[PDB]
Swiss-Prot record, chain A:
Its main location: cytoplasm. It comes from the Eukaryota. Initially thought to be part of the large ribosomal subunit. Crystal structures show eS32/eL41 to be a small ribosomal subunit forming a bridge at the interface of the 2 subunits. This is Small ribosomal subunit protein eS32. One of its GO terms (cellular component) is cytoplasm. The gene is RPL41. It comes from Homo sapiens (Human). Component of the small ribosomal subunit. The ribosome is a large ribonucleoprotein complex responsible for the synthesis of proteins in the cell. Interacts with the beta subunit of protein kinase CKII and stimulates phosphorylation of DNA topoisomerase II alpha by CKII. Belongs to the eukaryotic ribosomal protein eS32 family. GO terms for molecular function: mRNA 3'-UTR binding; mRNA 5'-UTR binding; RNA binding; structural constituent of ribosome.
UniProtKB/Swiss-Prot annotation, chain C:
It comes from the Eukaryota. This is Small ribosomal subunit protein eS28. It comes from Homo sapiens. It is linked to Diamond-Blackfan anemia 15, with mandibulofacial dysostosis: A form of Diamond-Blackfan anemia, a congenital non-regenerative hypoplastic anemia that usually presents early in infancy. Diamond-Blackfan anemia is characterized by a moderate to severe macrocytic anemia, erythroblastopenia, and an increased risk of malignancy. 30 to 40% of Diamond-Blackfan anemia patients present with short stature and congenital anomalies, the most frequent being craniofacial (Pierre-Robin syndrome and cleft palate), thumb and urogenital anomalies. The keyword Endoplasmic reticulum applies. Coiled coil: none annotated.
UniProtKB/Swiss-Prot annotation, chain D:
Signal peptide: none annotated. Component of the small ribosomal subunit. Mature ribosomes consist of a small (40S) and a large (60S) subunit. The 40S subunit contains about 33 different proteins and 1 molecule of RNA (18S). The 60S subunit contains about 49 different proteins and 3 molecules of RNA (28S, 5.8S and 5S). Identified in a IGF2BP1-dependent mRNP granule complex containing untranslated mRNAs. Binds with high affinity to IPO4. Interacts with DDIT3. Part of the small subunit (SSU) processome, composed of more than 70 proteins and the RNA chaperone small nucleolar RNA (snoRNA) U3. There is a cross-link at K14 (Glycyl lysine isopeptide (Lys-Gly) (interchain with G-Cter in SUMO2)). It comes from Homo sapiens (Human). The gene is RPS3A. The chain holds residues 21 to 233 of 264 of the full protein. Belongs to the eukaryotic ribosomal protein eS1 family. GO terms for cellular component: cytoplasm; cytosol; cytosolic ribosome; cytosolic small ribosomal subunit; endoplasmic reticulum; extracellular exosome; focal adhesion; nucleolus. This is Small ribosomal subunit protein eS1. ADP-ribosylated at Tyr-135 by PARP1 in presence of HPF1.
Curated annotation (Swiss-Prot), chain E:
There is a cross-link at K45, K47, K90 (Glycyl lysine isopeptide (Lys-Gly) (interchain with G-Cter in SUMO2)). Keywords: Cytoplasm, Isopeptide bond, Nucleus, Phosphoprotein, Ribonucleoprotein, Ribosomal protein, Ubl conjugation. Belongs to the universal ribosomal protein uS11 family. Residues 115-135 are annotated as: Disordered. This is Small ribosomal subunit protein uS11. It is found in: Cytoplasm; Nucleus, Nucleolus. Its main location: cytoplasm. The gene is RPS14. InterPro entries: Ribosomal_uS11, Ribosomal_uS11_CS, Ribosomal_uS11_sf. GO terms for cellular component: cytoplasm; cytosol; cytosolic ribosome; cytosolic small ribosomal subunit; extracellular exosome; focal adhesion; membrane; nucleolus.
RNA sequence: CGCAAGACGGACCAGAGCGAAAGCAUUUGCCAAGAAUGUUUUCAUUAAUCAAGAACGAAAGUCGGAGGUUCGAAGACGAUCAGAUACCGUCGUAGUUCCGACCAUAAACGAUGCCGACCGGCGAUGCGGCGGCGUUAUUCCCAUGACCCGCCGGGCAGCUUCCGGGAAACCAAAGUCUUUGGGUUCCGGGGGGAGUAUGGUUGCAAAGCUGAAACUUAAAGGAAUUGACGGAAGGGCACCACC
RNA sequence: CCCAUGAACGAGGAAUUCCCAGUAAGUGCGGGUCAUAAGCUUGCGUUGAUUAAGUCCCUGCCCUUUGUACACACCGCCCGU
């Protein structure tokens, strides 16, 4: 996997987690 | 590993070089990295020159030329055979082909 | 569309896609001061004569 | 059967007396029908004539744009509207191991004709020069450009449009600039690259007829 | 209708040849370019957009333009050849040289040749992306 | 043939210049800087590198204001395709532009910290200075410009070399290293988990800085060599290839 | 082996195979065949032909350079859902 797309997935995961923990 | 000491460009002593658009694909390529051709060709072909000169209202009108500057990117310049791959030793050579 | 003759002076080479044309230099008789390059189809020789239907047309050289 | 070109009349287009050859060619306009006068559809037309087709022994890369200021008796009387160089000449003049010094002046002649003159010059490689390049430093370029500006202003603001065009035909301004700049950096191809009509005075038929004879 | 002066003395027009890689324009105008005599394009002479810019279509267009200009009494032509210009290609399309050849072959006199494609002192952004066309 | 708007400064333009880096290309003027050279001027150790702290920092992005030409994330269609939520095409929003406030990240690269010394050669080039046959311009004299031939000093580089080094690629530095110590900052410790969780801090947001562990694994990896392969290029051959 | 009712057959689909001088071909003969045993093959003569003396396109095989994360070697390796 391209490293920048792994970074993008991690950032989307972090955003989803931020929505999880408000 | 490093293929070229100059990294395939002429960006020595500066930080940024303005980009240009490839004449073929319109890709953005640094002006010092793009492969530059200056083609000075007769505005009429060597076939049409006879008819055009015969039909001219002047005597020895000398047809004008056409001065075109082409800025190929590396992919387009390789595909168009303007430059080609060279051996590891022959890569260092910088004299233009004799033509 | 006049027809004229020119003597072959030097068989330059063989060209063509699969190879059918002989590129050759021909010197005109009636002038002998002008020579041209023509790609003749078929088996050609050295020193013979060739019948051209157009004197103002030349094929690619080299 | 409707043919627009059976409605059209052909007029001769004349050049001002600044040129050896007067008949620059023919122009066709639809015949007058009501308020759609042929004269008004014929006035304000720009003809780009090479100086070779305007003078017997002059360069062909210099073009003059002449504008039709009046029409009488199937005859269009053109006036000087601008000057230019052909693209081939300018493209040939720009080589890659020298500097191109470019200057421009907005200057009015003594008869209200406000022109914009562009001058272009190139640094000259010496006949014994071994260095590949012939670059002038920035201050040298500024001095050359100031000399260009002052010489063009002197050659334009002092005379009228007739004498201005008369010195444009052999391009004496370019030769003067080339002569003056050998003390700064020798120049190679000095030309008044382009002249354009910025402002005209009020139209007076008397002066136009004066130019046409 | 024809100019009053016969064709023994040349009457000049300006043939603007616009050779883009999609078709060819052969457009004869008055010396001032304001008034046009005949403008026929390579797309008016083929039924496929593939050959809209082919040399054959350009030669047909030049032949028809030359015949139409001869019928109105224009014997000589000033040539203003132009490519697409702007940000796009400065090289004329494949039909430019064929159009000029067929214009000179159709009993027409050739005046001065000039290149008039629009070259910017600098331009807007080119149509392609920063990576450009990728086909 | 004009007019309006916004964007951008082609060719000249270079392994050329300047800037701490990001970056910087129409003219002219103003403003404050700056290196290098020159210096038998002045001070006289005032210096190097630096936790903390601070300035600047491409692009994208975020707030307001102006503008809004082109191009154009998203999006709408048209194609291609087994399928295309892409490549190609027509439009096209944010954005791209400027002003103010944020953001502080890039393969922000020379993937190479800064200061100092020593260590081969050569030809170029930029700036300054010095010396000198000769040519050319300012109508003629010196000065000065443009050339020519050298020298010196810093600078961007190049070629060459059994300097030496290195796993080699390669590097006059990546040399002067088991014959190991000139000064100093930052920083790495098998591969993943992971630049993730968590706490803290910064931000309007997007996110930035700091930053694990459990667990898992015998290899990941660097350079080079020989093959094989290539919808890479160039050559050569053959009526089980063609003409 | 003899007798008669006897069928497309105006250059034969896209597309293809084998061919350079006693050659493509049309014809008979001895064999592996075989108890006389040939529509196959083999070997032999037999009458026998114009494009070809070239080239690298359609087809391939080789060579050099080059790229490689392939070496079980592209039918490889490998990413994610």
């Amino acid at each position: 996997m391209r490293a920048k797309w792994r970074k993008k997935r991690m950032r989307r995961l972090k955003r989803k987690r931020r929505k999880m923990r408000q | 590993t490093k293929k070229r000491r100059n990294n395939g460009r002429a960006k020595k002593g500066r930080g940024h070089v303005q980009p240009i658009r490839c004449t073929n694909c319109a890709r953005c390529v640094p002006k010092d990295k793009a492969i530059k051709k200056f083609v000075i060709r007769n505005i009429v072909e060597a076939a049409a020159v006879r008819d055009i000169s015969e039909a001219s209202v002047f005597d020895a009108y000398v047809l004008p030329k056409l001065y075109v500057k082409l800025h190929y990117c590396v992919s387009c310049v390789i595909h168009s055979k303007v430059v080609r791959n060279r051996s590891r030793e022959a890569r260092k050579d910088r004299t233009p082909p004799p033509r | 569309q006049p027809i004229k003759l020119a003597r072959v002076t030097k068989v330059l080479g063989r060209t063509g896609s699969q190879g059918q044309c002989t590129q050759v230099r021909v010197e005109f008789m009636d002038d002998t001061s002008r020579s041209i390059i023509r790609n003749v189809k078929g088996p050609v020789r050295e020193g013979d004569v060739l019948t051209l239907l157009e004197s103002e047309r030349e094929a690619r050289r080299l | 059967v409707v043919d627009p070109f059976s409605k059209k009349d052909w007029y001769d287009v004349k050049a001002p007396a600044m040129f050896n050859i007067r008949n620059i060619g023919k122009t066709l306009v639809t015949r007058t029908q009501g308020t759609k006068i042929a004269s008004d559809g014929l006035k304000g037309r720009v003809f780009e004539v090479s100086l070779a087709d305007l003078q017997n022994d002059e360069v062909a890369f210099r073009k003059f744009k002449l504008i039709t200021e009046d029409v009488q008796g199937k005859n269009c009387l053109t006036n000087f509207h601008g000057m230019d160089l052909t693209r081939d000449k300018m493209c040939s003049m720009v080589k890659k191991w020298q500097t191109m010094i470019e200057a421009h002046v907005d200057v009015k002649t003594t008869d209200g004709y406000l022109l914009r003159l562009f001058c272009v010059g190139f640094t000259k490689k010496r006949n014994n020069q071994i260095r590949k390049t012939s670059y002038a430093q920035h201050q040298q370029v500024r001095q050359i450009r100031k000399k260009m500006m002052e010489i063009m202003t002197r050659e334009v603001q002092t005379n009228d449009l007739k004498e201005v065009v008369n010195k444009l035909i052999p391009d004496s301004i370019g030769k003067d600039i080339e002569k003056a700049c050998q003390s700064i950096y020798p120049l190679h191809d000095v030309f008044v690259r382009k002249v354009k009509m910025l402002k005209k005075p009020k139209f007076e038929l008397g002066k136009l007829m004066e130019l046409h004879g | 209708l024809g100019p009053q002066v016969a064709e023994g003395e040349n009457v000049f027009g300006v043939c603007h040849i616009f050779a883009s890689f999609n078709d060819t324009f052969v457009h004869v105008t008055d010396l001032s370019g304001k008034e046009t005599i005949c403008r026929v394009t390579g797309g008016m002479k083929v039924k496929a957009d593939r050959d809209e810019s082919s040399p054959y279509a350009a030669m047909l267009a030049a032949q028809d333009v030359a015949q139409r200009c001869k019928e109105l009494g224009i014997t000589a032509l000033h040539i203003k050849l132009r490519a697409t210009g702007g940000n796009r290609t400065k090289t004329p399309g494949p039909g430019a040289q064929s159009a000029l050849r067929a214009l000179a072959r159709s009993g027409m006199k050739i005046g001065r040749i000039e290149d008039v494609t629009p070259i910017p002192s600098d331009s807007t952004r080119r149509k392609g992306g920063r990576r450009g066309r990728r086909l």
